[PDB]
Ligand binder design. Structure first.
Ligand SMILES: [Zn+2]
Ligand SMILES: [Zn+2]
Ligand SMILES: [Zn+2]
Ligand SMILES: [Zn+2]
Ligand SMILES: [Zn+2]
Ligand SMILES: [Zn+2]
Ligand SMILES: [Zn+2]
Ligand SMILES: [Zn+2]
Lengths: 477, 477, 476, 481
């Protein structure tokens, strides 16, 4: 039974045009002037875009013997209600390198996904087991490996481990991701701040100022380039890390950057709210920054030095945040934004002219699809693509509120944002997944998306590195 | 009578995939797994790409009562043999502002074109007539206006004129192009050099060092941004001008940059060749630069801070170059590259891994088509696009030589370049235009391509300027 | 009759040390542990620094058939009360190039000076007379020529004229100064804002945003470097112009930058004050900028990418400012800061640790003395130097107020600034010029300081340009 | 017995002027138009400048159970013959942190010094002993601590150790120095190149390309600025590390940079010379770089973003260099330049107009004197200063050659440099220490120069950090959960 989306205006990363869309067997069958189908969906007056891909989520993430509050069920509901049809989550193995066991456990979690998903595999140590299982992980359809330069004593790896891992990535045709903050300096700053009685939520930001992110970003870049592999920097929050990426790209290094919607539109003044709960709720890493940083990130999206908007979705209830009363290091880090990502970006970015509608599509789905090597299966409006689509009414308005959010927690860091232009229908592989304010996709409707290694940028870089490889001088006896 | 291109691998700016291409009525009718057509073109083992678009040509350009040696006939022949299916030439009006008259004169020239073409309209003065005829020029399908900051006493405009013209561009939804060298400093350096007996071809480069281009680029950007209109900088030849563009883009300014294939692969040491003819042949503006500048331009293409490769094709005979014997200011400026642009870029860029094949397509056709607002009619492999296509054999080799070039002049500045990967067939709106080393397109086969004003980037920028427009302070009596 | 300053701590651009200073015949005769002299000045608990040099003033400047309200009398009074012992003013000739005639008129103005002074010569056009008279100006002891890239129809020169003039500067061993704003773009923005009814004081700032200054700074640098002459950019107000200077210097170009004390400590929010008078009073060029720019300028001073703090002192009464009611282009541009420069810089810069005390001396006197080629006659505490000195009590406090200022106008843009550490005595060539809150130097006490052309940086740059000069290829 | 230097032209960092100089009791007694003294030294037609200060030497440095070949005797002879009157060497303790024991050993080495000297104290690990002895090291008159980010398994410290040490420096009013190369990445590149048979001298440069230095520079700066202490980056060899310093200074961070005379005038093409010995002799860390980097360093000296020229003097014989035949990682790292520093800089920098003569004085003595807090005792021509002076004949010429050098090794990486303008006499505390090509100062004539902590820049930075220190938000119980 086919669907035809009629009367809409298609917006993709490359063009905007009036067209009908015929959907058969979960895929786009045809795009053209007048199409017929068994079931008609009216998109008159609306835009039709690829469903959003959010490459950065932490659904049901383990914390202190419990979990974050949004799991793959409520998380994907929030995603769908915001026009996002795919999430990419981070698998977190132990330092022993039980990558495959951790993967199995994340598959169990993701069984509740209401829409399609994939994984990044984190690397939280280095040893022979880790080295071997990375090969198998790539065979299972995961082509990215996430590294933490912070979280000393938990997730952190050092330069030595990171270089070996990046080289293994290069070898497998995978691409490293990095959380770039200097973990040694943050740990000492945390301890010093706590020792001085500087223990409130605002001190979380004090313990990891922008220079600490800027440095680690620069270092991760050096190591990836030495290893001959592209690098993806997650949650680029400030001018210091953005500058490191621009400078690397101008040297011809292959580096991608991902600003969070939070860092595009929220700022550190939130931590100076007189209410402890209010300030603690906004604690995440990297923290909200000086507002001046926002323009840098926006300009990067427009200039192409930053490519993907994400949310780092990790939602905790007020009760969970309160674990850090009297100690900011015990406030669970994370704010949720899955539902808010595309709508906030549309109002703040497209309606203001900071982004063309086409750039909007590029930085919400198409770019990350290309970067993770699943374009055009995802992030595309072309025949043969998965029919993951959002129907966007440019005229509808709302005020963001915790009272109406699909996320399970009791607050919303975008509380009060005035929006115009909203997702009114979301389709996941041709199925109506969100409609008339209701999430219609059921838990288990989502499936794992396998990804192939050795994307175009990996291959070009490897070829170039071979060209410029330094050679031994031939010397007579 | 339809054509089907079978067995090939399609490369576009966004993806690479095996597919057949059905062509009907000069357009791409279908793209898919197995297609049939009246006539079969075998593309087994080959890549199929959008035909190149070269936005920077000067065919049959007036110089000293004569003309450049390549006209629209030989010019488009060379283009087609090099996989380029469209050229964009510059109409050069008198300073009185006889834009429409100049346009008619250029249509007469382009009657000989063998493949499709369009125009930029130059603005060489400022007055009421110019202001008025700009509106009429836009109605006739030209949405770009070219400005010269150098060539004092002939083409040059000042800051005042340039600002007025840019504001008019903003109003009409057109985009200014700029030749950015400081004309006043250049004229004085020329005169000082001649007065000192420094009168050889190498002194042309001396008379306009990179700082002179860097300054003018920076100034034109300021003025475009103040007028609220995007800016396209032609022939970005050096790091100083590239740096100005990167810095502007990081401020959120809408600026495009165009490196010439000459400046990517050739350098100023050519001017120090002992043979006068050899050095003079290479004289153009901006001149060939210190070789160190090339890596900057290549990185710009990979990073997206530069978007389009062109040739500034303006070919003169050795006899014409010799008009400047004893006086370098009288050496006609220009080198030809229409045929060599895509082949040299492929060998130097794709085969080395500096550019992915998709980036190659982006910077040889798709980007400029989008920028000139003619995507997807041109620069696309999508249904409904003009069937302007090149069939590329990645294994064929040749050495570039004047003896085999299609340009009418007696030398080739890319002489001796070893290539691998060549255009073996070129189609212009579904017609075989180049095949088996022969240009099969006839003079008059080319048609003028009209362009609409107010593309997406123009619209976004105007919207943004309105939002940040400074407001009067309300003061009570 | 000798003077000895006893018990103080000397602070110079290069060091800090306890020493007595013996003054004879208007000069520093000796510096050492224990000295005696005919007359004793007690500097116990105080710092002794070279008197400030403000390289940027416009005293009795011609405007609209009148003049600015602070002349060389009240202006040097203000300077002295702020620890500044020398001003450098701008001679403004007509565009016909009557440089010598204008110079004579400025000598008449400066007859009222209470402390020493020198001149910059502005170049407001280009022609044979201008080219010729520049040589004679250099012979008269002025080794700097000021160029305006803004003020279209009045002071402005174009790239062609500026290049010719800069080449003439190089030839004479002079150094160009530049007011860098794009005059063509500013004139058009002014007209547009006025046509749109955007006619308040705030639109003055709107008519010349930072990008316009950044561009012109960048262009002027290119032209000086092509001419092979060092360049001095006056009133670097924003990160865009500062960036152009840093980038140029890293290319090995010889460029100096001068942030005004206003742009270090005041910002554009002043223009949005609801009171029209309040906002109009702060109108100057370049305008007060977004506060974010302050950090860039401060860092430049500490890093050495900016070398001299000045005031661009050009004072108008409220009545004069009101000439621009309903039309911001008619508000006379300028604020006064002569008295406030060193004291504000001390509190905001030294007491905060943004500048070491030695850096404070460098950016208020020694650097500009060196740049204008009058070191160590001025800006120094060495034997043989002019005894131009300020005795600074680091503990005394005050709140800046128009009620206590020596400037003749009725307001103070630094109103309410809380200070600690103040000039308590100022000496000009050994004469007590400021003491007990009173200016004791008389009008006419000031003397013209002549300057030699061809300073060290001019000579080094010329030598280098000769080394790297492009040569003809020898062809049979 | 007084000396008067007559007829010369004084050049200092701040001015150039004709003056006589009267010297009494090892110090400058007076400067003026015509002075009289017991013994007259004729400086007619010559310049008189502060004697050079080279803040970066490794004389008789321990390596592989032996030592580098220039000790404090021949090292200081070389210095003096090049117009340099003071060297600053690096004390190298074991990782256990036996700083005082190491200091005593270095005093034994420096007993042979012919001209004055001082020390930097290296920190090669972190622990309680190290923390404690740093305080005593500062009390002995050493106010700098050197950190190595490279030389893994030998001298290297990590970010954690470096941050603790930088904070201790801040506390004591000391200033850290850093050798900034990423040691972990260098060690892995070394192993990779060796495994691939890329084992020649040129592969030394391959194993630590400029990005590896630029990264570590950027990192050391971040850490120093977080600790609230100024940082001195030794041997800034390339644009990447130079850019990191410029960017940091523009953020208002207090960072100094030191380009070596080698990196200003020599380049990596030397490693591709066909002769193994020739290439290996030039091996040092950081290696000679792409020639393009030179202009960046020269501009930094002229712009003030780099402040001091040094040599990293560490001299090995050809026989010692040959320890690395078949394995570039075993080639002892270091080249000598003590004698060549000021003369090469004068010809390449002053005679070309890249530096004014005054800037030449700044970057060869006065800046480092100020930075190490011993101005005006050293690096100055003012009354009361130590009479450490060089008399410079701007017209005399020579070509640098191993056959005439005062360094003890058998080659010279500045071989063939054509010079004009040379020191013809060097005075150390008023004693003629070098004259007419002869080193006249004897071993033991040099004395240790004590330095005080808490220089002006340290104090200003600490004050600024206090001003901008982030404060706890005051929250009433009304606003608490
Ligand atoms: Zn993270
Ligand atoms: Zn995360
Ligand atoms: Zn051109
Ligand atoms: Zn052209
Ligand atoms: Zn001005
Ligand atoms: Zn002024
Ligand atoms: Zn070292
Ligand atoms: Zn060393």
């Amino acid at each position: 039974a086919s669907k035809v989306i009629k009367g809409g205006t298609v917006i993709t990363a490359d063009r905007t045009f009036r067209a009908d869309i015929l959907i058969e067997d979960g895929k786009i069958a045809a795009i053209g002037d007048s199409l017929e189908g068994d079931e008609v969906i009216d998109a008159s007056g609306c835009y039709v875009m690829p469903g959003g891909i959010d490459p950065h989520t932490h659904l049901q993430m383990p914390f202190m013997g419990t979990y974050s509050s949004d799991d793959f069920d409520t998380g994907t509901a929030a995603a769908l209600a915001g026009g996002t049809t795919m999430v990419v989550d981070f698998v977190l193995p132990d330092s022993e390198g039980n990558l495959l066991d951790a993967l199995q456990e994340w598959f169990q979690k993701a069984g509740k996904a209401r829409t399609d998903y994939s994984f990044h595999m984190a690397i939280t140590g280095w040893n022979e087991r880790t080295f071997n299982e990375m090969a198998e992980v790539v065979k299972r359809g995961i082509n990215t490996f996430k590294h933490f330069m912070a979280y000393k004593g938990a997730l952190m790896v050092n330069d030595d481990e990171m270089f070996a891992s990046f080289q293994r990535c290069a070898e497998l045709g995978a691409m490293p991701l990095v959380h770039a903050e200097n973990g040694d300096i943050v740990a000492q700053l945390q301890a010093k701040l706590m020792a001085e009685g500087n223990d409130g939520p605002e001190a979380h930001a004090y313990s990891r100022p922008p220079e600490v992110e800027g440095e680690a970003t620069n270092r991760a870049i050096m190591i990836a380039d030495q290893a001959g592999v592209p690098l993806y920097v997650v949650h680029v929050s400030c001018e210091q890390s953005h500058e490191a990426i621009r400078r690397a790209r101008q040297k011809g290094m292959r580096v991608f950057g991902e600003p969070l919607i939070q860092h595009l539109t929220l700022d550190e003044s939130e931590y100076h709210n007189r209410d402890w709960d209010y300030a603690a709720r906004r604690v995440m890493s990297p923290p909200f920054r000086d507002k001046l940083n926002q323009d840098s990130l926006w300009a990067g999206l427009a200039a192409g030095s930053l490519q993907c908007v994400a949310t780092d979705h990790c939602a905790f209830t007020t009760e969970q945040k309160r674990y850090g009363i009297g100690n900011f290091t015990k406030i669970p880090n994370g704010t949720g934004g899955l539902e808010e990502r595309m709508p906030v970006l549309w109002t703040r970015g497209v309606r203001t002219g900071r982004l063309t509608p086409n750039e909007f599509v590029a930085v919400t789905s198409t770019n990350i699809a290309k970067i993770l090597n699943i374009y055009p299966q995802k992030g595309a409006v072309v025949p043969g693509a998965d029919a993951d689509l959002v129907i966007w009414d440019p005229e509808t308005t709302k005020k963001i509120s915790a009272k109406t959010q699909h996320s399970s927690i009791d607050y919303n860091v975008f509380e009060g944002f005035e929006l115009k232009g909203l997702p009114i229908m979301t389709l996941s592989r041709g199925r109506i997944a969100f409609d008339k304010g209701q999430v219609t996709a059921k838990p288990g409707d989502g499936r794992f998306i396998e990804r192939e290694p050795n994307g175009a940028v990996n291959r070009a870089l490897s070829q170039w590195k071979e060209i410029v490889a330094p050679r031994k001088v031939e010397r007579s006896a």
